[PDB]
Design a protein around this ligand. Structure first.
Ligand SMILES: OC[C@H]1O[C@H](OC[C@H]2O[C@H](O[C@H]3[C@H](O)[C@@H](O)[C@@H](O)O[C@@H]3CO)[C@H](O)[C@@H](O)[C@@H]2O)[C@H](O)[C@@H](O)[C@@H]1O
Length: 391
C-alpha cells in the first residue's frame, strides 16, 4: 500500500475545496503516496504544532503563513527540500520566497500560494472629485495631490493608511515596509541582526505617511473608510480582487503601488508556505513528491485560477496562458501579478512577530502626532534592536 503522508493546512471555503480536489487528483494519479489533508484553524495552528512536537505526532507537511516558517523551524526539524523537489521547479519559484524559505542553508519551506499588496481605488469617488476614473496615481506625489483633490472636493479621505498597531502590529508594519522598500530602504540588515530602516530612505517613507495624515488626506485611526465606499483608495491585498470582483461594494480599480519618482517599485509578499517535518529519507521524499506535483506549472496555473491566489512560479506569472486568462476573467488582478517581479519578503527571523509589534508601536506615535519622524525612527530602531539582540 502507499506511504501515508499527512498535511495540515488552515484553508476554508473555496480554497479548502480546491486543495481537497487537488489532493484527490494526486491520490488517484499514482499508488506510491496517499495524502491525508486536515484543516487546523489559523488561530490554533502554531499551538497545535508545539503540542504535537512534545507528543511526537507532528504532521508530515504543515502549510502555514509566510511569517510562521522561522517559528515552525524551531518547533520541529524541517527537511531540506533541495534535492527532493526538482531543481528546475525551485529555480522557477519566486526568488524572494525561496530565499525567505532558506534557514541554516536548507530550503525548509516552499511557497504554495502567494499574494501581494496593491493599490485599490474607488472610480466613482475619483470621478466625483474631478479625477480621471481610469488614471490612478503612479507616484507618491500623484497620490498626495489626487488624494488632496478628493478631500477638497468631497470631504472624504483620499487614501486610507493602516495607522494602528492592533494586537500584532502587522497591518501597520507590512503596509509601511512597501513604502520603505520603494524609497530604497531596508527593514533589517541582511543577517536579521539589527534594524536597517533608520536612514534617509526610512525617513522619506515615514514623512510620506506623516504628510498624508497632516494634510487630512489619510486621517489617523481611520482605516476602512475606503472599504465602506467612503474613501478614495487604500493599499489592499490581491485577495480583495476576488472577494470584491464577485459582490463589489462599489466600482473599484487596481494598480501597481504608487512609488516615489526618486525610488523603485516594490510590494510585500503574503501567502502559504509548505514545510516537511523530517522523518526517514523515504518519508521526506514521499511528502516532497506531493509538493513537487503541486508545484508543476499545470497544477500552479489551475490552483491560482480557481483560488484567486497569485502563482508562485515566475514562468506562470509571466506566461501567456495565465496572463490571457487574467485579462479575460479577472483583469483587475493583472497589476498584482505583474508586481510579483518587484515583491519583497519580510525577514525570516523567528523574532519577526516581536520585531513587528515593537516597530509598529513606535512608528504609530509619529502617525498619532505624538513624536517627530526622526524621533519615531530612532525609537523604532531602539525597540527592534533590543528585541533582536537580546533574543
Ligand atoms: O493588509 C491588511 C492586513 O494586514 C495584516 O495582515 C498581513 C497578512 O496579510 C495576508 O494574510 C491575509 C490572507 O491572505 C487573507 O486571505 C485574509 O485571511 O486576511 C489575511 C490578513 O488578515 C498575508 O497572506 C500574510 O502573509 C500577511 O502577514 C493585518 O494583520 C490584517 O489584519 C490586515 O487584514
Amino acid at each position: 500500500g502507499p506511504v501515508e503522508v499527512t498535511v495540515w493546512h488552515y484553508w476554508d471555503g473555496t480554497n479548502a475545496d480546491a486543495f481537497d480536489a487537488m489532493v484527490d487528483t494526486y491520490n488517484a494519479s499514482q499508488s506510491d503516496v496517499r495524502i491525508s489533508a486536515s484543516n487546523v484553524p489559523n488561530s490554533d495552528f502554531l499551538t497545535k504544532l508545539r503540542a504535537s512536537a512534545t507528543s511526537d505526532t507532528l504532521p508530515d507537511i504543515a502549510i502555514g503563513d509566510l511569517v510562521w516558517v522561522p517559528q515552525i523551524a524551531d518547533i520541529g526539524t524541517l527537511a531540506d527540500l533541495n534535492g527532493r523537489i526538482p531543481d528546475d521547479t525551485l529555480t522557477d519559484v519566486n526568488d524572494a520566497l525561496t530565499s525567505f524559505g532558506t534557514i541554516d542553508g536548507k530550503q525548509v519551506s516552499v511557497p504554495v500560494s502567494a499574494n501581494n499588496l496593491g493599490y485599490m481605488y474607488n472610480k466613482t469617488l475619483f470621478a466625483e472629485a474631478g479625477l480621471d476614473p481610469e488614471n490612478p496615481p503612479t507616484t507618491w506625489d500623484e497620490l498626495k495631490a489626487a488624494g488632496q483633490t478628493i478631500l477638497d472636493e468631497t470631504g472624504k479621505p483620499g487614501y486610507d493608511l493602516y495607522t494602528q498597531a492592533g494586537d500584532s502590529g502587522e497591518g501597520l508594519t507590512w503596509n509601511f515596509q512597501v513604502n520603505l522598500w520603494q524609497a530604497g530602504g531596508d527593514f533589517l540588515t541582511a543577517d536579521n541582526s539589527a534594524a536597517a530602516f533608520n536612514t534617509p530612505e526610512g525617513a522619506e517613507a515615514l514623512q510620506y505617511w506623516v504628510d498624508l495624515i497632516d494634510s487630512g488626506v489619510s486621517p489617523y485611526a481611520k482605516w476602512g473608510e475606503f472599504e465602506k465606499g467612503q474613501g478614495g483608495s487604500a493599499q489592499e491585498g490581491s485577495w480583495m480582487v476576488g472577494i470584491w470582483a464577485a459582490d463589489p461594494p462599489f466600482e473599484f480599480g487596481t494598480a501597481q503601488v504608487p512609488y516615489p519618482s526618486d525610488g523603485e517599485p516594490a510590494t510585500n509578499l503574503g501567502g502559504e508556505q509548505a514545510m516537511v517535518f523530517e522523518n526517514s529519507d523515504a518519508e521526506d521524499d514521499a511528502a516532497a513528491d506531493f509538493l513537487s506535483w503541486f508545484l508543476e506549472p499545470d497544477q500552479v496555473t489551475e490552483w491560482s485560477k480557481e483560488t484567486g491566489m497569485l502563482p508562485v512560479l515566475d514562468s506562470v506569472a509571466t506566461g501567456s496562458a495565465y496572463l490571457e486568462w487574467v485579462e479575460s476573467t479577472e483583469p483587475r488582478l493583472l497589476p498584482y501579478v505583474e508586481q510579483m517581479a518587484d515583491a519583497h519578503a519580510r525577514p525570516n527571523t523567528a523574532l519577526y512577530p516581536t520585531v513587528s509589534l515593537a516597530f509598529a508601536q513606535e512608528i504609530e506615535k509619529a502617525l498619532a502626532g505624538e513624536a517627530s519622524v526622526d524621533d519615531a525612527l530612532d525609537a523604532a530602531e531602539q525597540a527592534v534592536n533590543a528585541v533582536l539582540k537580546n533574543g
